[PDB]
Design a protein around this ligand. Structure first.
Ligand SMILES: *[C@@H]1O[C@H](CO)[C@@H](O)[C@H](O)[C@H]1NC(C)=O
Lengths: 50, 48
């Protein structure tokens, strides 16, 4: 699962059958690291109008 | 594909089904690949 976003430590608690979490637009906003089983929020990188 | 969803709930009602809400988490996804049209559950006898 590829993407680009800021990774932060997450307060969400995944059930053991869950690997990722989807938002309204079905983009992965939370993910479980497959080596150390911890949850990470994926806030997107900042977008601006110049 | 044989999907097992499971939930354990502490109940204390005597006879009928309890009235409430409890979502079943998926337990085992089992690779059998066979035709199933009829089933039968297994009980245990008590001998004395
Ligand atoms: C290796 O991955 C497993 C999950 O498949 C994890 O439980 C374990 O802690 C990992 N070990 C190391 C050394 O990363």
């Amino acid at each position: 699962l590829t993407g680009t976003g800021v990774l932060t430590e997450s307060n969400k608690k995944f059930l053991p059958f869950q690997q990722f979490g989807r938002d309204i637009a079905d983009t992965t906003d939370a993910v479980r690291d497959p080596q150390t089983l911890e949850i990470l929020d994926i806030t997107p990188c900042s977008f601006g109008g110049v | 594909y044989f999907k097992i969803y499971s939930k354990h709930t502490p109940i204390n009602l005597v006879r009928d089904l309890p009235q409430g809400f409890s979502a079943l988490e998926p337990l085992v996804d089992l690779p059998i690949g066979i035709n199933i049209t009829r089933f039968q559950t297994l009980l245990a006898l008590h001998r004395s």
